[PDB]
Amino acid sequence: QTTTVYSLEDLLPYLKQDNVDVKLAPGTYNVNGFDVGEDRLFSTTPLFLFEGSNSTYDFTDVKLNINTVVLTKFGNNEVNEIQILGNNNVLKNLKLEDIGTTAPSNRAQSIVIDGRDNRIEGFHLTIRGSYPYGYGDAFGKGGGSVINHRKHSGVLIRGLRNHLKDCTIISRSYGAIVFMQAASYPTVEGCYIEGEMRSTDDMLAEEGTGSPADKVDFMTVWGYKLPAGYMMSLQEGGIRAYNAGTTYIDGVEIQRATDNPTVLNCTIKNARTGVTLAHANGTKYVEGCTVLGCENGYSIGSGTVVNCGADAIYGPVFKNTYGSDKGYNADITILPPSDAYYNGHDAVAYIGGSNHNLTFRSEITEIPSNLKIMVSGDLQGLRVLHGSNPSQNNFAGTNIVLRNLTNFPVDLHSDSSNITVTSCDTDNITDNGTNNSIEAIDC
């Protein structure tokens, strides 16, 4: 019942067909610059466009090496390795690696999941090739950049009820690793997602070298010179939902925000954020995740974070995104450090908005002297200094339950009100707010 093919060339015709079961034979397949052209293997991007429905593709023991030169072979167009347009497809076990570090002519996405009821499982993806690489978003992630970018992102989940399951996604590229645009009921489950980090001090040491950042005197898009003392990811978000986007389902082009995302049992390491879903609508649910060495742990805006952990070595484990946040229910374990602390944000959590129920647990006994749980106040966050991103800082918190089962101190700013705090110790709580309740608990 399964058709086995032995070349990429033989594989491609099956992509336009419905109801097929195909296996690409174990082996290594290389895609080079010479494979792109009019009479070549790939005359268009996306390279692999899955247009059929109700099909299964088995990539067990297949290694697909794509030279990043391919990212420049299509003119000034976005290049995608895989795009799924059809429905009810299952793609499994592929090991895909970007070879070299050549940047795109415009931008690239490794995998794009449109349509409905699709699943990608057991993939091992390595993402490379982007510009600039080494600054994170300090010099621009969208329009009006200080340094123009050529981004290369990992898995873009769109469509309806699309499912990423048990994949490993390693990025050494400036771009989001797993992200959602116009996705309805996307699920990310059991994935390992990993970027890498660089200190702003190391970036600032490019002074006098003639680097791209040296040429702009390290002036960031946030309106100030890049500050020392922070650890940045070279990637964008680990798992991030966007509030805009376009998707294609059953012949229909759809422009909408992401809605109803679910993230289960994922591990995210060294990205700009662990799980950020505040811009998604509907029900947000995050369970069983581990976030290590990210610039921010969990920010879902509203919904449930349960049985999740994050360490605090490079940024807070928890951040309310806006003063409009409402109904954020979270139980987060502050994990032992995965490396030495280098947290310039001076906070393990920043809490605001209203009607939250927050529990923090930890076994940590050595508390860095700069780290505290903040309810309201002036977060010293890399991107929210000096009035930058003003809606994401300096906002009030009201009617919040805060169960602090940790040794971390708590600072309730004067803009806090009706905060019900329970804590292992009350001696390290500073309360400058209005009508707050503070009670001790035994352990």
Residue numbers in the entry: 1 to 443
What does the publication say?
FdlA from Flavobacterium sp. SA-0082 is an endo-type fucoidan-degrading enzyme that cleaves the sulfated fuco-glucuronomannan (SFGM) through a lytic mechanism. We show that the FdlA-NTD adopts a right-handed parallel β-helix fold, and possesses a substrate binding site composed of a long groove and a unique alkaline pocket. Our structural, biochemical, and enzymological analyses strongly suggest that FdlA-NTD utilizes catalytic residues different from other β-helix polysaccharide lyases, potentially representing a novel polysaccharide lyase family. Here, we report crystal structures and enzymological characterization of wild type (WT) and eight single mutants of the catalytic N-terminal domain (NTD) of FdlA, revealing its unique substrate binding pocket and identifying the key catalytic residues.
We first measured the enzymatic activity of 12 mutants and found that eight of them (D137A, K141A, H176A, F179A, E236A, R240A, Y242A, and Y242F) almost completely abolished their activities, H279A mutant retained approximately 65% of the activity compared with WT, while mutations of Asn243, Arg272, and Tyr322 to Ala only negligibly affect their activities. Residue His176 is located close to Tyr242, and the H176A mutation shows a slight influence on the Tyr242 side chain conformation. Therefore, mutation of Phe179 and His176 possibly results in the dysfunction of Tyr242 and hence loss of the catalytic activity of FdlA-NTD. In addition, His176 forms a hydrogen bond (2.8 Å) with the hydroxyl group of Tyr242 side chain in WT, implying another possibility that it might play a role in providing a proton to Tyr242 to facilitate the catalytic reaction. Based on our structural and docking models, several positively charged residues such as Arg240, His176, and Lys141, located near the +1 subsite, potentially serve as neutralizers in FdlA-NTD, weakening the negative charge of the C-5 carboxyl group at +1 subsite, and making the C-5 proton susceptible to the attack by a Brønsted base. Next, the positively charged residues including Arg240 and His176, which are located near the +1 subsite, neutralize the C-5 carboxyl group of D-GlcUA at +1 subsite, thus reducing the pKa of the C-5 proton, making it more susceptible to the attack by a base.
